[model samples]
Target: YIWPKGNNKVRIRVLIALGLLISAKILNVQVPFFFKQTIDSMNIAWDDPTVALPAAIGLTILCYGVARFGSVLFGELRNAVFAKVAQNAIRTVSLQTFQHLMKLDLGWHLSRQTGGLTRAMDRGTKGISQVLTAMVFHIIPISFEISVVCGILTYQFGASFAAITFSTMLLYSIFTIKTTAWRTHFRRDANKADNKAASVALDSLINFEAVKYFNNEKYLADKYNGSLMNYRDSQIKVSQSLAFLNSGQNLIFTTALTAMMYMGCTGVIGGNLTVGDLVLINQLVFQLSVPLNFLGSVYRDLKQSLIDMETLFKLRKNEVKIKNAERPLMLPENVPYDITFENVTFGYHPDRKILKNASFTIPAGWKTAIVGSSGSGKSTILKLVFRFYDPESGRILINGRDIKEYDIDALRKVIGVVPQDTPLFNDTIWENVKFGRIDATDEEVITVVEKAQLAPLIKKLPQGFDTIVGERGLMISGGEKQRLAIARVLLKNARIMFFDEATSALDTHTEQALLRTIRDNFTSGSRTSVYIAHRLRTIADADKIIVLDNGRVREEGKHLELLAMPGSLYRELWTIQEDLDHLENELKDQQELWSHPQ
Candidate 1:
């Protein structure tokens, strides 16, 4: 835990809690003294039948009650004083970890599973509660209480009482430490099975439609049940071992206490001890044992809590592969930004490169289409432009300046991107649109929605634009979601508008309309647009086309010019999709003739 040492409110609260807790612990010890004194004075009266008897016993009894009450009050007030610090630690630590996880390089996240990461995060915050409050507030004070008891018993009663107490404590600690160490094996297994069951449920639910199509509900249930059974087996083992530890601890404490009581009884009979002395020894022993019972688990819990928080602390050290330059520069906003790759080479992993020594540039104020085969690194270029990852050995320049020179966050703000796979947040349609431009006015949102032709789709919904979308909400059609994505891009008036198959789901009719919408909205100013297109027909009129094969730019020219190259890969790619379209037309024509012949 990061101690808030510089914070005045939290620091003062911590000191005050500690002060009150110590006072309470000392008061608890003094309370038994009041009981012992009252009994001894009563015995003295029994021997004499003296006057002022009520005054002596009555005052001691009242003070004993008052001391016990005061101890409890101070302990509760200590909890109250530290409550704000504990809760604020949970809140702030969780937020700090979450923000760091978001800023980590994209590849790191791609390798990690979301389900496991979230579980780790959840357990870590719970660990903060344990380590910050349980260990600090309860365990430390209990240590002080035990140390005081040992010292007082040894000095006051001359080693016999202390010996009995210390021996029992040592034996109990050994038993607990040994048994709990043995039981931890089963406890860890149970945690693994529990975590697996949770992960399986998360994955299955997210792919619920796939499971339904495969008709594998029974299969999934059996899988979940197997993990549940595994968890139950180890959990039961942990419970059984805990019972063994408890019984052994009780045996040691009882044997030591019984021997102690026997010694007290003998001392009283020999006239070496009073009845009050015996009673005092018994009360004091019992008091020490109260905290002693909880002491073993406190150690066990601290070890486990440290394990959870360790994973959370690891995230801060995760490398940011695309860190901005120190003293980063900035480009003028709301102006055209062109991109260049100077022999850039990179990949998601080593041993395979997605872009290899590829050099290219898109001039300002023109629409450029990145046309290539499915795996020709078309989308990878967009990722680099956004600075999600840096190149391994090359420089990427934006407007002739190395992209690394600019603030990483500021560079992304000048570009608006609509990816091929558009996944919406689970929010209202209106809210999702505004996510693209957080400060967009309502009239601007409506205007962009109209321009993107999304108003017609929104009107059909029962709640219009208020209809919720994404995973937990209404599942809209692919075309409607793409338009929602386009509406988002439209609202954000960035210099560079990059669409990775923005109209992939729509029919050609709407595709042409949206292309025209892009032309009308973005063609007037100093702006650059890039399209990563698989269906080559959509980008036929692109001002320039960069033909990428594998990882290198093979050709760059107008569509007609590329078509004139007889052996060009661009021509082959276009013809391949064109033949597929022709095949569809031929089938439709055959079906039409058969109906007419009848």
Candidate 2:
């Protein structure tokens, strides 16, 4: 259920990215060529000052023009491409993570944290792109560029001069690889420490209200400080290793440049080489070392990116085993479809069975109520009915056809659900109800709002329906939130409705009002209602009552028929609620007595 959200300007985006990389790489490589020409022109000018002056100046201008153009082109291109890639990568990865999250079942979602998952998604796109860019465009190409320059020098000059250049290049490569290898472990440790610190900080904030309520601020702060210390120690070790590697790289580069200059000087003194040739050799040697010198820093950052991205990839790959057909099943001609579970059995995971040989039948029109003790898989039945998870054995059918054959969305869209703990977003009250149908107009939203007994609450707010509900609608009471949820499902106008302990949190008066609303809406009409109730009295009038225990239905009949049995789970629950009702009344009387003239 993710909406279409991305930039559709595909052609323009690709063209811009390609143009930037090409324009930058070419411009950067051209720098060495201009410097080589400048040195040759300078040598000619030195031999015949007057004649070569104008030619020398023109070549110098050409060299300067090329170098300047190259620098600007590279700087601009890096800015544009990095900006575009970074932003787009984040956008694409987040949307993908969100879709994967939605495809997971409610049981799967209950096991994870909201903050940690989102942080992983955020890091993957930015970190992976940075690492990939350096590996593909920076390290490999720049290495090749140095190789090309060395090859050209050896071809132009003989083995004697070429030996000096080639030996220096090989020395640079050896040191770069050795030092990068030595520093890799420290860099990786530093990154792990950083992730740990970030996770701790996020967890503290997510539970900040709990921390304050429990007066555990000191405990949390001490733990955070320990994490901070670990991060700092690891970072210091990384910095020391990096500092050593950088110093060694610079020393090697400088020593190589000095060796090349010595050879060039010898050739010039021997009258075999011109002053311009000596200068050209010096500049070319430095250019050859440029890409090689960057190896140490680039290697460390790439390893850190690997650590960051691996965490995110694990979350994306997490899958819940829910089967969906490639295409929706061909439904019957009519909308209200008959659903049946013939000896359906299932388990959330392999070890424990939640539903065992569960057989149930529901015709299109009437309300069916399921009641049992807390862990009897009463609510789990609704999950299987909608195909959140399929049965391990036996078949679930819709309109006399296997449910597995139907498209998942096509099946879920036809059913509306309100779980015991309702989830709502921070938005206007109107928007909260309209989530049943996002395309619903304000007038349509208001009608459902009134029907669900939220009209009075809406009127109390300054803006009526337009009033904002705070995060998870904390601004509203528990009873009101339940009504808002009821209103939302009503607006969905779905063919089937499931209420899983839907009124368990409400006052008796509110619960009674809702029961009346449900009876009026579902019975004698177009909707199919399935009620899961723990307070058995609320569903005592249900057309069909199903009692389950230990994943098996203990009894199935109307309320009176179940009551006729002397010792049963339904009778036990009814007796307990009656006792609870008396206790509640006694507590109220005691409170009033204490408030009087004592």
Candidate 3:
């Protein structure tokens, strides 16, 4: 797993770097060996005045310095070669995860929290680096160094000394692994709490207006603080558990060192080993101690990193509800997409059915308007037509073929949608408009803006098209944003369009003016339009109006035909809108009279 396939060149580099690292570690272990020889040479010289030990001492000192330099040189060189491999691994995993998320079905996305999803991906990518560096540089090399040190003790000092050293290392590793495993739960809890707290903060910021409107700033803060407190408590537990593990590891190392030193002194006193041998054993144990200390740290971090990576792995395994066919159909070129819903029945859940046997035919080049009261399944038709969700019992066809047969991307490419709530990127106006058709030229964008009747708004802006639309286009007025959405969809130049309350944000005058321009210019072409409107009066001139009530289509006729039908849902809605309009007119007249001092 550490050396994944399909990266042969990087794999080769990693192996070469590892070899160099081991060589460096061996040289580092020799530093203390040569120092012990220097001390032994000085001891012999002091005993014999005639025998000079200067040459021996000087040569050992030179060897020690060279070994020290070589160790550092190889370590740095290894890092230089391996840096590309480690960072590339991170890039590969991060990009693949991001692309997979984009390909996932709409249902999967709707079920997720944006803040938590982002945090998981971020941490998982970081874990790739942590796990790689810790395993390659610390764990593997430390294991090799410990084995070599123990081998030296067995060959030089005796079986007893080697046994002590090896047993101590084994115990140390086992303790670290077990304790770190226990601590993983605490770290996982901390991570979960952190994700939740981040989600809360992001939600509050995204809905800042709602909080202020409800006068719930204190309530939001308190809710957010509660999440933060859980995170803090989990982190404290993580720290406490880590400290206990470290203390246990340190105790094992010290006890082993003391035992090795005692054995070395006894060997010296019995004349079975020289003073230099005792010193060498002591120095070797000290060198082993360095990596042993690092071993504990690497184990802890590696465990936590793997847990982080598990979250992303689980996300990758999530099933895409809408899977592409083994051989998906593509949209036929130059075919006009006339949409038809044949006895379509669907709902978000079985208990709350949103649509029931809803059948309609939006003929090619025709304008079809769907109207209903709140939750009467007006918007549900648009969603089904868009293929965001498939019908449970019936077929939705475009160009006389099942929509599910076509590649989802190809299907989406032929349609444009202007949603009820138009969300924009935090970017310049030009950039936001360009998103509808990324390859569209600036001149083309401006043409659509003018066509959408947004020329006056753009001209009034100080920065013109370069003005920044703040987060979710909050910097612009609602009507201006709606106009921008229209311009964006117009730039797409799709064969079919779905407009869900597209003109609801506009005043009556602007809405009528824009609709007139669209009807005269845009629909005059062969493009089909499906309009979902809450206000029945706005769609009075549509080619056909389908009135819905209680998840079923109640009436399908022209405006006057629906009004001509007695006790019809369409007639009832029309009467209600007419009465509301009359009341609004009377209110306006009273305000005018009051302002005029009549």
Candidate 4:
């Protein structure tokens, strides 16, 4: 666990610093020898008035000061050398964990809370620093100090002095370990409560408009407050446990110090030990107290660090659902890509099926449209084509090759999707457009923007292409955002394009204009296109139409061909839309008449 493998240079530095640190400890241990010697020399001078400022006493005093300086100098030097190792470890683990999260599948992401996941990683990184610092700077050095002190006490004084010293340390260790273990539960509960509060706050803030619309601000605030109260209670428990641990530790150390001092006084009085020996024992016990006092804190903190790190390590163990094939196939060189779903059966849950033996084929260079009511598996088809979820029984083929056989990245490169939900980052228009094809030049981006019918809107903004889209592109209108999504997909210029209700947010006039432009500019070429829509009128002229009902294709043909078939699903859908259109027109006429009174 020290300096991890492959860090040869850093490991070498640690070893060198360790050697110096041990040497410094030896020097620290020798300081008491000089102090003993200095006291004995003064005793000699007291016995005889002939010695004035004796050279031995002066030399011992100088050596003692030098030893003290060496101890501090080497301690700081070791810390300086070890800094890189600690920081590098944190960086390595943090970046690796982040990369792993990115590779995980949608299911893995959907199941976890964003705030909690972030907290785990943050605490895990901080834990590394705590674990390393306690082990390196406190635990190891304290053990060395204890050993040196006990060895000298037994050698110079007697077995009794060392026995008392060793027994006190043993009792202290037992008490600290037991107490910290008991307090660990409180700490864990506090962390859990904190994570809950953070998740609630983040979730509520992200959906701020929902709270405002329902006038539930007070309700949400109260809910968040309840979580914080739990956290506060847990923290109070931890603090109380800490106070108990501190008091018990102090009692143990005080008892040992008093016992050691009493033994030294008795030995001196019985003429069994010199005054110098008594002073040495006193100094050693006092020195041991410094690290002993910190041992309780270090032990508690090390336990907490382990808990935090365990959470992160568990996240690393989560396997990615979608993985690259052993020998991934690349897309064949072709002008247009044909997509075929062959008897596919799939479901998000084991018992609830979303698609049952669904089969469809979109011919190359054809504009195919899928229309159905809600929960009809229309959107699920697009997700399946994108390989976001694998089908249960059948294989989806692209260009007659199984989609699973191809590299996920390579397969997605030739297909572009404009999803119903248009998500944008908080960045400039230029940056978001360029995100589609990162290597595309500004001129290429501008060209695609115009082709997507977004040029007019972009020109109206005061900042033009440089305007920042606020969080989730909330700064722009719904239609503008949808057009921006179209522009992004257009910039990719892929062979196959999938649009899921792309123009649903636009007004009727804008919708018709955009549809005309898409038909004239995009659908005319040898590029494959798939459209998922609810409005029957929009797909009236689609080259082919597939009507899905309850996860099954009930009707498939060109718009007019299916309509000519009486009592067909397509005809029924067309009749419903025509009735709605007539009703809407009659209502508009009535409103106009009432306003003008003509």
Q: Estimate the lDDT of model 1.
A: 0.81
Model 2, span 468-571: residue lDDT tens: 78775538876788888888888887788888888877467767777777666556476777888888888988888888888888888888888888887778
Ranking by lDDT: 4, 3, 1, 2
User: How accurate locally, in lDDT, is each candidate?
Assistant: 0.81, 0.74, 0.82, 0.83
Model 3 C-alpha lDDT per residue in residues 1-598, reported as the tens digit of each score: 4445563563787778888889998998788789878877777436666765477578889999999899889888888888888887778778888888987878779889998899999998788788877877677777787778888788889989989888887898889888877887888899898999998899899999998889788998988899999999999998888789878888887888888788888988999887888778877877776666666656666777898888877777876777657888996788677888889889998888888888888888878898999878987887777788888988999888888888888888888888777887888888888888988987998888887778887788888888878775537777777777888888888888888887776456667665666565466377888889988987888898988888888889999998998888888888888898789878887888889744
Candidate 4 stretches with Cα past 4 Å from truth are: 1-3, 6-10, 38-62, 176-248, 269-272, 298-301, 324-326, 426-429, 442-475, 506-521, 578-598
Return the lDDT, model 2, position 352. Answer: 89
User: Model 2 lDDT vs. the true structure?
Assistant: 0.74
TM-score for candidate 4, please give it.
Answer: 0.80
TM-score of 2: 0.77
Q: How close to the true structure is residue 79 of candidate 4, measured as C-alpha lDDT?
A: 85
lDDT of 1 by residue, 1-598 (tens): 5666764563677888889889888888888799888878766435555555577579999999998998889888888788877887778878988999988888889899998889888998888788867666667777777778778878867588887687777777787777777877887888999998997798799999999899789999889999889888878888888888888878887777788788888888888777877777778777766666666766667888898889888867786777887899887665577888899998878988988889988877888999898668886888889888888878899878998999988888888887776888998899988888989999989988887778888888998888888899899877677777778888887788788877776445666666676666666367788888988888888899998988889999989999998799989999999997788778777988887755
Worst 10 residues of 2 by lDDT: 1-10
Off by over 4 Å in 3: 1-3, 6-8, 44-59, 170-255, 297-301, 324-328, 453-474, 506-521, 584-598
Give the winner by lDDT: 4
The number of clashing residue pairs in each candidate reads 0, 2, 0, 0
The window of 10 residues in a row where model 1 has the poorest summed lDDT is 44-53
